[PDB]
């Protein structure tokens, strides 16, 4: 059966106010001689979690300033630098002063992904959607949440290791509710999650199907470390009565490209475990390649995520570039920051993530991957 569940949370977008706190100690009952048929692909907890996360995002973004005047013509010179690629744009614009009859010529430092030409540029979302600035105090850090069933329902956990996503689970337990799910919004690599028990776990709805993604779960985490080395000072511009807009006023020196590092010595033999478990499915003689990315939107071609409040888009063309045959150097991934974010594949509700002052660092755990096969491959 399907039922609505509530949090058990121990300022954030994932508000802990309008749902109950956690029990002091979990109650886990091991159901002996019970073999229940799980199917995570038809799971309704995933859909309820997705709807709840979208709702929390909407309720967090709702009581904060709409940046309606920002969709104007922008005189965008390149930011002061010696150089190949001008990624940061120094855009000046007329903005509405708190008095309706007065204007102010202000400026900001936008990104190249946030502006499209018409020297006259405009914000990328003026064509398609209205924009709402995220609240600066409100933090985007994931927080654990446990989804707990109401009275008359129970949650069965599959304590059995080596568990395939579908089919019978010989070792079933009942829990009041789950562990910290920690809702990280990322693509191409699962960050901050469960780390399995025995060996790397390959799970797909149909292995033969290409159209359905492959979820890989790691044994040991692969540590990924980011920096946005730029300073990106924040400045407030009063765009109306009681309404403020936070712009990247200036950058203290060394305009450098953002990046997240992975260890080469760990990512190799992590991919070794992955290709071993994949050859378990596709025969013990097939050569297994990993390729850059097929294509698509920016959110999919690049490992996109939120580090320290800023939205990174890391290339990861060096990670997935390997050929595997049956028989302290770091991989640096150049990431691109972006402020105009269209979350949950929704068009109509954009969002302006404010600048974060100073430098920001990831130290996160790659605990899994999402993949897709290439199709074809007759024999």
């Amino acid at each position, epitope marked *: 059966a399907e039922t609505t569940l509530f949090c058990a949370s121990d300022h954030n977008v994932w508000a802990t106010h309008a749902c109950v706190p956690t029990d002091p100690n979990p109650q886990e009952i091991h159901l002996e001689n019970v073999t229940e048929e799980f199917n995570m692909w038809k799971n309704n907890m995933v859909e309820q979690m997705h709807t709840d996360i979208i709702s929390l995002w909407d309720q967090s973004l709702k009581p904060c300033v709409k940046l309606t005047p920002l969709c104007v013509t922008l005189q965008c010179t390149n930011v002061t630098n010696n150089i190949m690629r001008g990624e940061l744009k120094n855009c000046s614009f007329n903005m509405t002063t708190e008095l309706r009859d007065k204007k102010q010529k202000v400026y900001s430092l936008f990104y190249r992904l946030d502006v499209v030409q018409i020297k006259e540029y405009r914000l990328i979302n003026c064509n398609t959607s209205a924009i709402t600035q995220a609240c600066p105090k409100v933090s985007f850090e994931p927080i654990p949440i446990h989804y707990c069933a109401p009275a008359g329902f129970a949650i069965l956990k599959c304590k059995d290791k080596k568990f395939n996503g579908t089919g019978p689970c010989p070792s079933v337990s009942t829990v009041q509710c789950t562990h910290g799910i920690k809702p990280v919004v990322s693509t191409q690599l699962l960050l901050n999650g469960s780390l399995a028990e025995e060996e790397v776990m390959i799970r797909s709805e149909n292995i033969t199907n*290409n*159209a359905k993604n492959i979820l890989v779960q790691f044994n040991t985490p692969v540590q990924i470390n980011c920096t946005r080395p730029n300073n990106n000072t924040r400045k407030s511009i009063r765009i109306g009565p009681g309404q403020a807009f936070y712009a990247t006023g200036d950058i203290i020196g060394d305009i450098r490209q953002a990046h997240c590092n992975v260890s080469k010595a760990t990512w190799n033999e992590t991919l070794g475990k992955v290709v071993k478990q994949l050859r378990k499915h596709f025969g013990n003689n097939t050569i297994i390649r990993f390729a850059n990315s*097929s*294509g698509g939107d920016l*959110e*999919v071609t690049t490992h996109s995520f939120n580090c320290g409040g800023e939205f990174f888009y890391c290339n990861t063309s060096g990670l997935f570039n390997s050929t595997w045959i049956s028989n302290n150097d770091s991989i640096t991934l150049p990431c691109r920051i972006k402020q105009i974010i269209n979350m949950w594949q929704r068009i109509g509700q954009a969002m302006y993530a404010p600048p974060i002052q100073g430098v920001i660092r990831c130290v996160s755990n790659i605990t899994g991957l999402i993949l897709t096969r290439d199709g*074809g491959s007759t024999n």
Partner: nanobody
Amino acid sequence: QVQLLQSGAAVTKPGASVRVSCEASGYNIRDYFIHWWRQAPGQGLQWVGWINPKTGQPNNPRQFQGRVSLTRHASWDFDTYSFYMDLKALRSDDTAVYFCARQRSDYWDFDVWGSGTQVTV
């Protein structure tokens, strides 16, 4: 009125590039993938590859890899969805009728197909 209206036939020299349009409307386009197929003269069908209309993510086989670019363009308010298939380096073997079906469900049951575009080289 599920419609998958294609573009007209094109004739292109070897070494040049071509684009085939598959203007789609009449349903939730984002829910179902769009699979491009090619059929050579007389021979059986062949798989060019699928595109996800939400994320624009393509998936082409090893044979068509590096020479096929599947893209999608979403109109304002999501009324129409122009699906483009670009072939980069056409050859004599690339002459075919190109169809663009939709994958309704997990059975790969292609229930609506485009009219087909004849590409000759």
